[PDB]
Amino acid sequence: HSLKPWNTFGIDHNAQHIVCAEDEQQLLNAWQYATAEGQPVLILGEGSNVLFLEDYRGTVIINRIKGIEIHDEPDAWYLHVGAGENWHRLVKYTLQEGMPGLENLALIPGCVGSSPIQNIGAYGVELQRVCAYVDSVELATGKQVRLTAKECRFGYRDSIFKHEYQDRFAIVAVGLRLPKEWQPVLTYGDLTRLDPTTVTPQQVFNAVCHMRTTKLPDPKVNGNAGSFFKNPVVSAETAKALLSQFPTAPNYPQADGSVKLAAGWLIDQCQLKGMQIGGAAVHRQQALVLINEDNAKSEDVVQLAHHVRQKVGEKFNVWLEPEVRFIGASGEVSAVETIS
Ligand SMILES: Cc1cc2nc3c(=O)[nH]c(=O)nc-3n(C[C@H](O)[C@H](O)[C@H](O)COP(=O)(O)OP(=O)(O)OC[C@H]3O[C@@H](n4cnc5c(N)ncnc54)[C@H](O)[C@@H]3O)c2cc1C
């Protein structure tokens, strides 16, 4: 079974088995079967954040558990969504149905169940801001476990499901809390050109869609997992010393006084834009997005990643990490040790 449709990169590799879970109980029966046969199981929404390095020795379960539930409270509308729901259709549905708050995360691919895992970020907002609780099943017990926004252990590009719980729990619904008083987040990019007294939810959504659709590579033409690396977050001291010699590295102040450096700039300083290693290439405008340009195989993407990490690491002593998840033959592997 070919994973090449279950992969936004377009890399053709095979899993021993592929199955579409339309519901919770079917997801559990499939998992209990594969694991009783000694197989690794891998849950998946749209493949938009994985890199399949070998052919997979187990069952992939495509999670299509659909369903939106709106609930009105005095303070906020609480949405209860299914893990199989598409995230950008959810962003246009809440903005069509009178519910602002999600526009800055528009056109991120993947499924709603994915978004607590990597804590999807864009244009200032991260999922954490509108995430009330997450519903997941303990796959080895049948057991529904509802974790709340605190117990999720959210961080920049991080959650509990990225390490303690990944192969234990399966997300089946997400609880979003959208407040009735909309604070517009006009903090990154061309959204800074927007006056907060004239700004409508729909035009925020509009600005973000144009930025994305013009700067980022469409998976239909160029295979990718979007921004291959996470924007480094350095401490104010380590930042200050870098800004004394490079004084406009485009950096953002994080909530705790830490500094986010733009990885798109650093790579571009290293004159890496356009670099093809095999059929994999550094995207020319968006230098953080490694693409599948000309029939790229996994080694091409791992070797160009290692090289982009190594040249940015020499010129600036800022050691980059991949956001994309690396999958070996029998499960997930450390993305950094593979590209170091
Ligand atoms: C062009 C492009 C732009 C992108 N922009 C962004 C962005 O702005 N911000 C951002 O954060 N990401 C971005 N991404 C990456 C991606 O969209 C997100 O990381 C997203 O959360 C992945 O969607 P997915 O459902 O396809 O995840 P998948 O790749 O299918 O899965 C990701 C990981 O989560 C697990 N997982 C997936 N669904 C479940 C579930 N129900 N239960 C348990 N585990 C599950 C998988 O096993 C895997 O480890 C972009 C990708 C592309 C191609």
Side-chain angles (χ1 to χ4, degrees):
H1 298 59
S2 183
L3 302 156
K4 191 211 135 294
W6 312 103
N7 179 267
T8 42
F9 240 120
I11 283 181
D12 195 328
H13 278 159
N14 302 308
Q16 306 311 287
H17 194 228
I18 289 188
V19 64
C20 285
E22 298 189 336
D23 80 279
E24 298 196 38
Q25 207 65 285
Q26 173 170 38
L27 206 163
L28 267 157
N29 291 319
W31 192 91
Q32 290 167 186
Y33 188 80
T35 61
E37 248 69 339
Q39 297 191 285
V41 189
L42 179 88
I43 318 281
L44 203 92
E46 296 192 347
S48 56
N49 205 66
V50 281
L51 185 64
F52 288 109
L53 311 181
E54 296 171 83
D55 278 342
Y56 197 69
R57 298 190 201 149
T59 298
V60 182
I61 307 182
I62 283 112
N63 188 320
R64 288 302 175 264
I65 296 178
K66 310 293 194 185
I68 319 297
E69 278 176 40
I70 305 166
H71 308 101
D72 201 309
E73 288 304 279
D75 56 276
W77 327 77
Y78 287 64
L79 307 157
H80 187 76
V81 194
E85 285 297 347
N86 195 271
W87 188 261
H88 187 235
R89 303 190 204 133
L90 180 65
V91 185
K92 294 167 73 183
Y93 173 71
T94 64
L95 287 170
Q96 211 92 230
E97 263 303 309
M99 289 174 277
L102 288 181
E103 65 295 322
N104 298 52
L105 300 154
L107 288 184
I108 300 185
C111 289
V112 182
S114 235
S115 69
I117 301 201
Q118 353 294 152
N119 185 24
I120 52 160
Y123 294 101
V125 307
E126 290 200 271
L127 195 74
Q128 174 186 34
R129 170 181 277 251
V130 299
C131 163
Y133 59 84
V134 169
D135 288 331
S136 42
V137 239
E138 189 170 322
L139 297 162
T141 323
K143 189 186 184 193
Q144 290 72 52
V145 161
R146 167 170 290 191
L147 296 144
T148 38
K150 182 190 163 296
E151 310 185 324
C152 291
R153 218 129 300 178
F154 290 136
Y156 176 62
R157 251 61 180 176
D158 215 46
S159 77
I160 192 171
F161 305 105
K162 275 182 90 102
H163 1 41
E164 224 153 345
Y165 290 9
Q166 46 172 279
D167 286 312
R168 266 198 189 286
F169 283 86
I171 299 176
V172 299
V174 190
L176 294 181
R177 185 198 104 145
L178 296 188
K180 284 170 163 285
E181 202 210 37
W182 184 61
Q183 307 164 260
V185 187
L186 270 43
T187 190
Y188 282 48
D190 308 342
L191 302 182
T192 57
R193 290 155 190 59
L194 298 172
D195 184 22
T197 51
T198 63
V199 86
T200 60
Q202 283 281 353
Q203 77 193 33
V204 190
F205 171 57
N206 289 326
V208 175
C209 286
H210 171 87
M211 280 190 265
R212 293 190 121 262
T213 54
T214 57
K215 298 181 178 179
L216 293 177
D218 192 342
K220 71 159 281 185
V221 47
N222 289 117
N224 64 99
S227 307
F228 199 84
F229 298 99
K230 332 166 179 173
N231 284 313
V233 182
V234 301
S235 63
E237 270 55 56
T238 32
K240 175 271 300 139
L242 184 57
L243 295 173
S244 70
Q245 47 204 313
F246 294 95
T248 175
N251 63 234
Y252 305 91
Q254 304 288 246
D256 67 303
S258 265
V259 165
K260 184 190 273 173
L261 293 166
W265 185 85
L266 306 173
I267 289 174
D268 181 29
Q269 293 292 288
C270 294
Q271 284 180 83
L272 288 181
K273 288 182 167 200
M275 163 125 247
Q276 301 175 265
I277 286 183
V282 178
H283 193 46
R284 304 176 193 134
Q285 311 174 356
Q286 262 307 340
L288 198 42
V289 193
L290 312 194
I291 67 173
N292 179 359
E293 167 121 75
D294 218 299
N295 279 101
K297 67 197 178 193
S298 336
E299 293 187 279
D300 302 0
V301 187
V302 178
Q303 286 174 285
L304 175 56
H306 169 83
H307 176 238
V308 174
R309 182 201 148 67
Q310 225 85 64
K311 275 191 176 173
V312 181
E314 50 93 332
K315 189 172 194 295
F316 302 94
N317 214 36
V318 287
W319 295 97
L320 267 51
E321 282 186 72
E323 186 186 353
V324 194
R325 298 186 75 185
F326 287 33
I327 314 302
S330 48
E332 187 163 344
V333 304
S334 177
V336 167
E337 230 295 299
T338 303
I339 72 165
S340 297

